[PDB]
Amino acid sequence: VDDDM
Amino acid sequence: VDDDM
Amino acid sequence: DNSYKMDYPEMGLCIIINNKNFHKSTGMTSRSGTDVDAANLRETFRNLKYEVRNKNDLTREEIVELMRDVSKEDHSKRSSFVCVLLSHGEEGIIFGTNGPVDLKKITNFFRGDRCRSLTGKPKLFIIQACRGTELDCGIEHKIPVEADFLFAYSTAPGYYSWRNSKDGSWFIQSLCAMLKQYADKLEFMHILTRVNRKVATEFESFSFDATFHAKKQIPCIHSMLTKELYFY
Amino acid sequence: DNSYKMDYPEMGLCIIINNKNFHKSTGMTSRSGTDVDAANLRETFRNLKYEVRNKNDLTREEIVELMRDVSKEDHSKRSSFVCVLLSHGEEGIIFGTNGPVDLKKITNFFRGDRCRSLTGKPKLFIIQACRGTELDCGIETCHKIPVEADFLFAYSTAPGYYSWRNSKDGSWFIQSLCAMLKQYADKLEFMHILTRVNRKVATEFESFSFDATFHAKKQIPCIHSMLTKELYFY
Amino acid sequence: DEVD
Amino acid sequence: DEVD
């Protein structure tokens, strides 16, 4: 928490 | 200490 | 011990902050190629068994808030912490999408006394950003609260850092390549030394602008580590 | 591999600038213990087969002249270059007896394009000096190369911080540097030796002062490496 | 090639 | 102990 890709 | 030149 | 204990249940977090586009109020150029870097790093650190978190286009406020929150997590089961900063910069400074933030303000959250579950563990900051505007023309009981940090800078203090719009930055290209080839063989400083050589020897700028043409780059390892670091 | 060629006829020069006594007008205190540092360094680098030249109490003008002259020497038969600076300082600055000199001015003489007989060879700058006034409270438990390539700066302390010196034993960093070199120069790469120096200073030293502000303080040295190959003294 |  |  958390991931853009 | 010393001195070299 | 001669080497950091790296057999905690988890290798650690790998936070990647990828700033490509900056507010018009800033003017700063869009950093073409940085998505190649961010994807290369995600894959590279995935293979090293890091829990990778990619973040794109963060304001300087969000960068500080992200770093604060991560430093407040429980890293007791993690061997290490990695943070990669991809953006514009100046000496001592990284740019959020809307302005500059002090590197010291980011790294302070992880001080030995401020993040106790990372005390004694390696804290790696990898920085693709300019450190000024010079060009290289080339030729031919207790521990310190600042201990166990390593800063792997793309370029020497005072200098521009180079990024290719198609291939990604020279530094991250080379970093990922050397980690892929040597992470199961060499201690991290020796890996970063090969990165220095690769960047220094295999890259040279090509520009229609004579002022920016045929320039060179040497990365700079800033180590306050107290032990050797192996990824296997 | 990836190692510097260290079998030239000579290992190289080791210039030690030992500034103990400063002009009264500067207001800078005398650096008791630094002669211990200077002698330790002379013996240590002698055993590594460096040509050591000790200089004491140089003005800012004499430091610049010395560095300029040494950079104009023919280093063609030398493997490397070492410069040790022992003095007061601040970030980016080392003090001559009568005022400051920019470290960037000093190192620029040895740039790859300005000192051609040291191009491609390791240039080591070892600096015992303050980098500011912060105190560390600690916590319990053609092919071209860049002109800035092949420099290494081994700083006694982190950016922004004081560096510590014991008046009887010499500086924490130089003490530790010499011991680690003596023990490991025949078996470890230089970066790994300096990491052990980092370890030693960080763990084995802590300030003792009757002054609470300065008591129980810690230090971590800082390696700045722009080296392109591994460096071995054997 | 571009600078950061 | 003294500082530099």
Side-chain angles (χ1 to χ4, degrees), chain C residues 174-188:
Chain C
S174 298
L175 180 59
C176 294
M178 297 303 83
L179 280 166
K180 185 172 188 175
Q181 181 168 3
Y182 295 107
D184 69 334
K185 309 168 184 181
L186 299 176
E187 192 271 334
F188 192 42

Side-chain angles (χ1 to χ4, degrees), chain D residues 52-69:
Chain D
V52 185
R53 296 177 197 170
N54 282 84
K55 301 308 297 184
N56 308 285
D57 288 344
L58 302 194
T59 64
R60 63 182 170 183
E61 291 87 9
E62 289 167 332
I63 291 180
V64 167
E65 180 196 31
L66 174 62
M67 297 294 102
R68 184 185 288 117
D69 291 345

Side-chain angles (χ1 to χ4, degrees), chain D residues 31-38 40 86 128 164-176 205, chain F residues 1-2 4:
Chain D
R31 301 183 53 259
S32 319
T34 192
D35 290 342
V36 172
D37 280 357
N40 201 0
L86 309 179
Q128 172 54 45
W164 287 93
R165 164 179 40 79
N166 184 274
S167 56
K168 176 175 72 183
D169 305 335
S171 69
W172 296 359
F173 178 62
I174 300 300
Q175 276 186 68
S176 299
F205 293 85
Chain F
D1 291 324
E2 295 174 4
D4 264 337

